[PDB]
Amino acid sequence: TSGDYWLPTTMSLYQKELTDQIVSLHYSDILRYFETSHYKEDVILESMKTMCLNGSLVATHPYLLIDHYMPKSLITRDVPAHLAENSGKFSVLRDLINLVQEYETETAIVCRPGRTMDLLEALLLGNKVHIKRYDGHSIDFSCTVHLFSSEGINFTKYPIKSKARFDMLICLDTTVDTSQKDIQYLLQYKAPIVRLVAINSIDHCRLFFGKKFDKNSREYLENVTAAMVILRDRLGTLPPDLRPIYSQKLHYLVEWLENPTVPWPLPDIYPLKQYTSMDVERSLLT
Amino acid sequence: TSGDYWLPTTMSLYQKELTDQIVSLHYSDILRYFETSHYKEDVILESMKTMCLNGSLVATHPYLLIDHYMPKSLITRDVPAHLAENSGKFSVLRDLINLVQEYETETAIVCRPGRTMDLLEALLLGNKVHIKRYDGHSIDFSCTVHLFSSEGINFTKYPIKSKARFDMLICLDTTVDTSQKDIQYLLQYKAPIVRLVAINSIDHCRLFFGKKFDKNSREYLENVTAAMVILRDRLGTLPPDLRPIYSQKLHYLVEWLENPTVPWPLPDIYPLKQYTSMDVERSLLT
């Protein structure tokens, strides 16, 4: 295929409920937003913005949104499994690095800076992997995983030590813009993009409609929020045919990890319906 | 020891947050309750009551409180692990029946009727166990697990088929009154009580102060609610010395399952502090 693939992930029970709660907090704002369509009050424009942000943080990990109860130490042996258990996306990734840590490879992961980067590292300490960060921060393996910010790197204070290609570039959140100059640099080190996408979540909406309407388009923001709200009851659950692949811990993907030139083994990004303002109001009544 | 033992359990991340949310919903009522100490308005008396009930349902399983997103089928192979993952108490019990299913034994479990009973069954379908219910409802193993209501049985429409002792009686919730005539009947079938107690939760409060003050005592209700609210930041986390035992999946308890006459391997119920109305107001400001 194209070198640009999505890897759908699940949602925790907790991740599903937090999203249902985020939507409900913004109930009034959502209706105000679709009602007075053709002015968009900034109280309300930004109420939708923060809603999509919050739903997006949860989609990757609930700790990005709700701090307390978070382990004082992210370094203890129990942490990696605790984090995977509370994010369907971390789980998928944990299964993925379990396959690639079997290889002599440099693998790149791009995600937003800050706490996302520290939880990614916390997680990867449960894999047999070297971890390199390029933000001056942090807490005998054949595979090294490099963590890059999606919001600006700085290769002249932190150069790539590698020497070798990145065999794949993983996108953890929809915060990553793979077209930016810094990521296009990583992709050409001598590279396939796999995007971790929680099914039927804001990630899935941003991705799919990101084609459709592009930019900070009118119909983009609207379709993305209508679908986030409406699809909110089908968060993180896979079509029945994907289920054995994930249950078998993504072993399905080994031939593709062997030959990254081989066609992507999984279905293309599932289409998301175009929803009406009336579609959204129905969903909110229920 | 005495034949009456507690088995501390953990809390899910989701279980901890729901409890922090339940407490917060009742913020005003809690302060009103401790403020006008010496009249207790029933609006407020029952506000504390429902708070303790809700915190107690979550302590056993969040689905007892928040229905939606709950699997349409509790019978599919994935369900048992999904339920254990969302209740620290279900996890402990899953580890426990993994030990005892190795034996030719009749094991009794008492819990409140209704959905608690259906989730207990859902869970136990993931163990190599026979399951008997005595409430006319439901969805080659050496071990059979009998599920009894804590709120009245009816042995003359559903008699014990067993023929053999119950080697242990497990208390899932604080809903079980082991002194009642129906449970004292089960305990003498020719029996050790193990109580599944989520640490630093309402279960732990009811148990500990249930000695202390007994009955629907004045100081009982008050100490139990002050401690629930105050201990709400230390929900479900074990003292460091218990952690390998649970990490090693309760294998620590096998010699005791071999000889139930052997002294209980674990520490006695940890004491809970007596808290002030001023103690509770501090906790609520923070």
UniProtKB/Swiss-Prot annotation, chains A, B:
Subcellular location(s) of the protein: Nucleus
Cite any additional comment in the entry.
Present with 1100 molecules/cell in log phase SD medium.
According to its UniProt entry, the function of this protein is described as: Required for activity of HDA1 histone deacetylase complex. The HDA1 histone deacetylase complex is responsible for the deacetylation of lysine residues on the N-terminal part of the core histones (H2A, H2B, H3 and H4). Histone deacetylation gives a tag for epigenetic repression and plays an important role in transcriptional regulation, cell cycle progression and developmental events.
Self-association state and partner proteins as the record states: Heterodimer with HDA2. Component of the HDA1 histone deacetylase complex composed of at least one HDA1 homodimer and one HDA2/HDA3 heterodimer. Interacts with HDA1 and HDA3.
Per the record, the similarity remark reads: Belongs to the HDA2/3 family. HDA3 subfamily.
The protein depicted here goes by the name HDA1 complex subunit 3
State which gene encodes it.
Answer: HDA3
